[PDB]
Design a protein around this ligand. Structure first.
Ligand SMILES: Nc1ncnc2c1ncn2[C@@H]1O[C@H](COP(=O)(O)OP(=O)(O)OP(=O)(O)O)[C@@H](O)[C@H]1O
Ligand SMILES: Nc1ncnc2c1ncn2[C@@H]1O[C@H](COP(=O)(O)OP(=O)(O)OP(=O)(O)O)[C@@H](O)[C@H]1O
Ligand SMILES: Nc1ncnc2c1ncn2[C@@H]1O[C@H](COP(=O)(O)OP(=O)(O)OP(=O)(O)O)[C@@H](O)[C@H]1O
Lengths: 699, 726, 157
């Protein structure tokens, strides 16, 4: 036989004392591994560490050969989750007697009802062998009818920790509050809801979805057939799937399995059917079982494409038949993780299989603040400044991106702080080092957001349109009672017409920044994107070009034909909608009727304030005191040029400087003069006059 | 039982002489090998021979069976690396006696304060025998001197070095020569950080990052953050990462237990993982300072490909879940070196221990002369030319040469010197031969390094004198190319974002391709010609793989520039609805071109003849920043072209002013001028054989050959397209 | 040979003596399985729980090794249709003795004319292995109805 794989399972009957340090290995396996029942053996996940618990005969033969029963206390020491691989090693080192051990309490209660006439004996009757974990749940110990947890944090006198057998008189018992085990052994710590981010709605939905079949499957089976079993997690990558599934597996006492998917299927062999059947049979063997699937889309892509694969078809068919035959009254739940909803196979994403859909939204500034505070609390904050206002400012300054590799920002900030402190103090101890915020800001700028592959100070705005934009974003939304009682349709935005080089893009960026909600621009020449507007709900949608689709050509025709369905969807929830155009005369006559485009606003060159702000922002990279520019003469000279030619001027000046004196420390007026003379009068007056005529005829 | 391989371990106790030539062999192994402690045991590399070391008891059972011991610094003589497999043999023969031994100190200025009362007796009280080359830490020496060492240069009176016998008073001891030992022994040499130049900027970042963890890592102990246990070194092939790994292993003077293998696996289902588990468990127990994992892509590529995820998926998963151990205290630093940067699994790069992702580029511009001089000094301090100007010139020439190409050039120069010496002196001894610039130039011509390989085609030679055209276009192109290529710190600090892309559109025969060729010849010193329709393949997935390969693998930072002959043949799909090869390749190009802003100064260049098909989901604001009209040559440019093409002709003998001909050809371009000159020359050759002159009648005859020229309709179309683009 | 699969088959005759707890297995595979004739073996569909049955010697030659013979009863326990995949295991556990069992036939009104002993004799021939899924024919002499059957409900122990 040679069993090279073993699993774990909690013992029944709720054994006390004798439950610890016992591994009821099969007698055939026990004799095969030349280990006596009265001997110490190493049980644990392969290649990681060991626990050194005493093996057992196994009592009756009704138990499966592969599985060995272990108590929950031992498993929690090395974070041995249900269904983890186990390995037995014959060699053993005699454990020395424990001396001057120390014990702690997980809860905050300390020095209360210190009887110790049975607690000390408890550490002796449980077959000895004291581990740093010692998660105690046996008997009923309390002080005023309240459960408490006792942890033997440390015992100092290739495994998780050296084995020590407790002795009645050779060691002294000291009690203190630690709330955690000693960090010298660096034992794994199970994840808790305190360490993870907030995600209140998502975590609540996931908890309800997991809980509903878990505790009452009999009622679902009696009421009907095919209860919900499949749970699908999708959204943007990096938001957290492996971490949350690990958390929900740790918090549950049911059997779990790790199914990556590439390892389950054997390439060019077609053994995925047998592998999946064996996995599901093992899951069905134990009533409490959890099925975890990672990257299900990669395992089973869409069947529409001819390149999906015959092995993909086989695995889809076997998954379908196994889900059909898994039964209804069983207490089984399947959790599937996928990268994008589009890559999910359409047959799998059908009613009756994955109805309970769980999605993780893009974290906002509040979620970023919450996760930052949670991480700072988890990290040792004996020195780090709390600074709620600083955290809020950092979160607001950061561009809106999903909670991906956010801990990497803290890691690189710590690295920068270490590098600064080493040079500052000539290799001093960490306790004397100081942590600042400039390094964190520099690291955050360097790493940059990776979600895609603007600020009100960065991009200015015109005051004339500020009141109108505020009205459009507030009155329909902030006070909808008047519209509801008067039956008045929402304005549904306005039409902005202006030259490509004017401040229309600047106005759009100012609107986006003032809204405070991230958005993706929709190109003119470029159904799925439009459908996502309703699903998200509170957001902003902007169209860069509408003139092309107003009257490629096929894409423009499709967009202008589907705009009719867009209006119907937008009628129910207008929220806010804006668009831009270059040829106003191409717009449809039926699109100018009241109730869809109530008002039309003309946009032109940026004002003096916006021009000054843009000049200051583009000069921020350069220097102002050495250059001597007042940031106003340039604006006066190039007021009518365009709203974006200043970037070209700065680029030309920088290029001239770097080709005239190589590395640059200051920028002289000669480069600016050359840039100004290079390009003159980019805009045209005739097209602006046409815009003015259109504005006049509009009303 | 039956241990085929053994691993050495430095002695924990420090003592001069006592620890030298001592091997604490396990008593069970020693008894099973039929060797007593009073006999010498051969220990050495798996591919090398053993060395003379006396056996020991083994210090009871403190040392495990699978591990042995050896001298801490004697291993440096043979360049022995910790953690590598060793061989044990029973055959041994008593060596003879040796005399007139020679030793050399590391310091350049020897012969000072040599008491000789302690040095002589050290070689007798160390329980060892003299070996060519000796390393020992020793202690403070004499007065006013730091810890110095002496290396046995030679010992003259199937092994890496012949053993001998040394005594105190029966032989004479003298010291002379330099640190380097005699090359006749074929012994290797130690590798230090000075042995590598140029990369050093990358090395400074890597040595700092590797070192904080390898030295005192107590700073992040109470932090609890993810521990840094890797650097993820990567770069272009042939950049010299292996020599950096060897240097960092040798200079660390610690355990280097690691193995690369050619994607080593096992037929047994469990053994292929148990081997890695045992290796990692030993690494945790034996605490090597650096662990080497080479060719990660070969052993663990991305899971996106169907065939790539086989076998390696479970291996990489277990490696990821196991490397997250022994936090805070504990070095266990593993080094990951790979050739393909993007082929690594994204899930492997996800954890923060590879946040740095230090990448080493090919040497260029600076430090090339320094590394050339360093390698010349390493190979031989004499019998070679040492001129700063010559080294600088050879470094400036062939800007695309990697350090491996430089070593190949040096080897070919040595070969050329040998050939010249043999042909000149009829098989004379080559010791007195000297290297000159002529053999270096011949080697540079004849090497054809691997940088230009895999292409088999090279662009024709062209120079600025050979082409005369509108100075404005040349100035704009030079501004576009030289400014970002020379340096990048100015661009990074000042925030200047160069377009890194130019589109050449104009009438046919306007020499945009010739301009690109001249640009590649002048600044790039390297050309990578890619054709649009060439990347197309019959298979659905082969085209995307080919374009990704030609975009990523063959790209070099400063040397390589990619030029598109006709970019207008890719974007338009004509009547294509969906699932088209052209659409797929266009989407792949857009995906691989929208994620790049500065990167490595790729500064791509494209040429076209019909710009109207370009604007099909390709024209984006990040690529339309720079537009070059590329107009027809003016009268001055046409006159320059006529003068250049007429240089072979005898203008003075013919008396032609080369002015009215240019004035008449006002609507022509360079191509038409070249064609008419060629026709006139051919007619002159045909009419009266060779005459070495051209007359006015030849030009008149060739005038009718030209078919009109640039018609105004396409010129107006180009003008209106330029106006629309703005 | 290495037989990793088995197929259910029906007996050529009704086998009035031993309808239940009869599974013919080839002696060659049985010997290679280290299973004695007086040893219980669990058989069932792949990926599901097995049904224990006593091993029986094969019917000499001209008997396929792959096939396993059952009679209308073991198949009906797990709704095993002919031709379905089967798996064999050597793990056997001694079951407790049955007590306080109840039997009630479907599609039939509650009547006491079965004489309450003719059905008992059929259970004696079973010799253990009592499960809630059993389908029989109860022979004849029951209200003069040819198309009738009896099914066991469950056991209260
Ligand atoms: N909500 C969160 N709260 C706290 N930390 C988080 C959260 N989401 C992500 N993280 C951090 O980011 C890491 C990335 O998440 P995880 O490892 O679960 O990957 P994933 O997003 O499921 O994977 P993939 O890149 O394949 O989409 C986590 O390990 C954790 O450190
Ligand atoms: N700093 C340096 N000074 C001198 N030579 C160097 C330096 N760095 C690299 N080299 C050269 O690079 C080569 C080292 O090759 P190595 O064995 O490291 O493989 P490689 O081609 O770089 O590997 P890979 O393609 O896998 O990265 C030698 O020719 C060596 O002379
Ligand atoms: N200024 C010039 N000096 C020398 N030769 C020139 C000059 N201008 C044009 N020519 C000649 O005319 C040719 C025109 O260039 P080439 O044949 O590469 O085509 P192209 O203009 O790039 O057009 P296409 O778009 O068809 O590739 C040059 O190869 C060269 O022979």
């Amino acid at each position: 036989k040679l069993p090279a794989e073993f699993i774990t399972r909690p013992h029944p009957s709720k054994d006390h004392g004798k439950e610890t340090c016992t591994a009821y290995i099969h007698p055939n396996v026990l004799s095969s591994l030349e280990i006596n029942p009265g001997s110490f053996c190493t049980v644990g996940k392969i290649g990681e560490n060991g626990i050194l618990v005493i093996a057992r005969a196994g009592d009756e033969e009704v138990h499966p050969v592969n599985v060995i029963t272990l108590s929950t206390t031992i498993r929690s020491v090395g974070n041995l989750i249900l269904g983890d691989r186990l390995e037995l090693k014959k060699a053993q080192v005699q454990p020395p007697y424990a001396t001057k051990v120390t014990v702690g309490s997980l809860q905050g209660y300390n020095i209360l009802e210190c009887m110790e006439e049975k607690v000390i004996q408890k550490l002796l009757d449980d077959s000895g062998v004291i581990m740093p974990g010692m998660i105690f749940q046996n008997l009923k110990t309390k002080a005023g009818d309240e459960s408490i947890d006792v942890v033997i944090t440390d015992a100092s006198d290739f495994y998780l920790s050296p084995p020590f057998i407790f002795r009645k008189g050779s060691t002294h018992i000291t009690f203190s509050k630690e709330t955690q085990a000693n960090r010298k052994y660096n034992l794994p710590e199970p994840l808790s809801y305190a360490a993870v981010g907030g995600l209140d709605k998502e975590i609540e939905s996931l908890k309800s979805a997991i809980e509903i079949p878990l505790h009452q499957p009999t009622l679902f089976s009696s009421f009907g057939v095919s209860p919900p079993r499949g749970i699908l997690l999708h959204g943007p990558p990096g938001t957290g799937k492996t971490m949350l599934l690990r958390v929900v597996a740790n918090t549950s006492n049911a059997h779990v399995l790790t199914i990556n998917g590439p390892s389950i299927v054997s390439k060019y062999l077609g053994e995925t059917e047998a592998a999946l059947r064996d996995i599901f049979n093992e899951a069905r063997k134990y009533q409490p079982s959890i099925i975890f699937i990672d990257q299900i889309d990669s395992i089973a892509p869409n069947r529409a494409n001819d390149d999906s694969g015959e092995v993909e078809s086989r695995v889809v068919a076997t998954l379908l038949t196994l889900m059909d035959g898994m039964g209804a009254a069983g207490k089984v739940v399947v959790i599937a993780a996928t990268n994008r909803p589009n890559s999910v196979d359409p047959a799998l994403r059908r009613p009756g299989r994955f109805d309970q859909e769980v999605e993780i939204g893009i974290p906002d500034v509040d979620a970023r603040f919450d996760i930052l505070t949670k991480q700072f609390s988890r990290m040792s904050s004996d020195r780090h400044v709390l600074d709620s206002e600083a955290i809020k400012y950092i979160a607001s300054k950061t561009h809106g991106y999903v909670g991906a590799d956010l801990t990497a920002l803290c890691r690189e900030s710590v690295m920068k702080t270490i590098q600064r402190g080493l040079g500052t103090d000539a290799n001093i101890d960490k306790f004397s080092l100081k942590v600042t915020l400039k390094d964190v800001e520099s690291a955050m700028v360097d790493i940059r957001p990776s979600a895609m592959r603007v600020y009100w100070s960065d991009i200015g705005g015109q005051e004339e349109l500020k009141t109108k934009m505020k009205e459009m974003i507030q009155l329909p939304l902030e006070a909808s009672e008047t519209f509801a009682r008067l039956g008045i349709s929402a304005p549904k935005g306005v039409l902005l017409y202006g030259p490509p080089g004017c401040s229309k893009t600047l106005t759009a960026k100012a609107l986006a920044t003032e809204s405070g909600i991230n958005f993706l621009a929709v190109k003119g020449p470029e159904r799925e994107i439009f459908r996502k507007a309703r699903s998200a709900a509170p957001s902003i949608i902007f169209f860069d070009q509408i003139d092309a689709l107003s009257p490629t050509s096929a894409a423009n025709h499709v967009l202008t034909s589907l705009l009719n369905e867009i209006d119907g969807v937008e009628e129910l929830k207008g929220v806010v909608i804006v668009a831009a155009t270059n040829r106003p005369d191409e717009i449809d006559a039926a699109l100018l009727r009241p109730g869809r485009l109530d008002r039309h606003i003309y946009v032109g060159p940026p004002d003096v304030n916006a021009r000054l702000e843009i000049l200051k922002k583009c000069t921020k990279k350069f220097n102002t005191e050495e250059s001597g520019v007042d940031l106003h003469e340039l604006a006066d000279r190039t007021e009518g040029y365009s709203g974006a030619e200043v970037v070209l001027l700065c680029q030309e000046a920088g290029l001239a400087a770097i080709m005239e004196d190589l590395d640059v420390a200051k920028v002289e007026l000669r480069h600016f003069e050359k840039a100004f003379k290079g390009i003159a009068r980019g805009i045209t007056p005739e097209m602006l006059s046409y815009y003015e005529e259109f504005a006049l005829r509009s009303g």
